[PDB]
């Protein structure tokens, strides 16, 4: 598969029907429908950049995930930085502790779309730019940090 791009991912919006997401993502040329999710690939290297899309019971988009379409531009994550964070922080308090440029916006979810509550916003913050670098993982539920983990930082 081939052809999924950052510009396509930005065009795709919550509540869109599975059929519309599929078409705008590039359909069979670019995507695989795994049932639980749709995976759409930038190029034939299926370890390469890709978007994933998930649907509610009504087949409307509620969840966008991306790997290397928008990577962390300056990966610098270190364990001392991970140790500044604690669950209960607001996003502002978090970004004062952790530089935004070291994190990738991994996923955004609105499980109750078209209602906007229960928003989950997930970040992966790697320590270096090489693939599979040690990283920290963070989840905000409605703007409060509810999950944090890491392995092998620095």
Instruction: Identify the structural domains of the chain with CATH numbers, from first to last.
Output: 1-154 (3.10.450.730)
Tell which residues of the chain come right before a gap with C–N over 2.5 A: none
DSSP class of residue 100?
Answer: G
Helix or strand or coil: residue 104? strand
Nearest-angstrom CA–CA distance, 6 and 104 = 13
Nominal resolution (angstroms): 1.7
Cβ–Cβ < 8 Å for 12, 61: yes
DSSP class of residue 114?
Answer: T
Half-sphere exposure of 127 (CA within 13 A, CB side): 15
- Angle at CA of residue 82, ends 78 and 86, nearest 5°: 170
Nearest-angstrom CA–CA distance, 56 and 58 = 5
Cβ–Cβ < 8 Å for 114, 107: no
Nearest-angstrom CA–CA distance, 151 and 97 = 18
Which residues are CB-contacts of 139 (< 8 A; sequence separation ≥ 6)? 120, 121, 122, 123, 145, 146, 147, 148
CB atoms within 10 A of CB 117: 10
DSSP class of residue 84?
Answer: T
Helix or strand or coil: residue 53? strand
Helices (DSSP H) in 1-154: which residue ranges? 6-11, 18-25, 27-30, 79-82, 91-97
DSSP class of residue 90?
Answer: B
Give the method used: X-ray
| Tokens read off for 37 | 């999710």
Torsion sign over Cα 73, 76, 78, 84: negative
Which backbone phi and psi does 129 adopt, to 5 degrees? Answer: -85, -20
């Amino acid at each position: 598969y081939t052809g999924f791009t950052p510009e396509r991912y930005n065009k795709i919006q919550f509540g869109m029907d599975r059929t519309l997401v599929w078409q705008l993502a590039g359909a069979d040329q670019s995507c695989s429908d795994q049932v639980e999710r749709i995976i759409c690939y930038n190029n034939p290297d299926h370890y390469g950049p890709q978007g994933h899309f998930f649907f509610n019971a009504a087949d409307k988009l509620i969840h966008k995930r991306q790997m290397e379409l928008f990577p962390a531009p300056k990966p610098t994550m270190r364990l001392a930085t991970y140790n500044k964070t604690q669950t209960g922080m607001t996003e502002a308090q978090f970004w004062a502790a952790v530089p935004s440029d070291t994190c990738s916006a991994l996923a955004e979810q609105y499980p109750n779309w078209p209602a906007t509550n229960g928003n989950l916003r997930e970040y992966v913050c790697p320590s270096k730019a090489e693939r599979f670098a040690p990283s920290a993982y963070f989840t905000f539920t409605d703007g409060k940090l509810t999950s944090r983990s890491q392995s092998q930082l620095p």
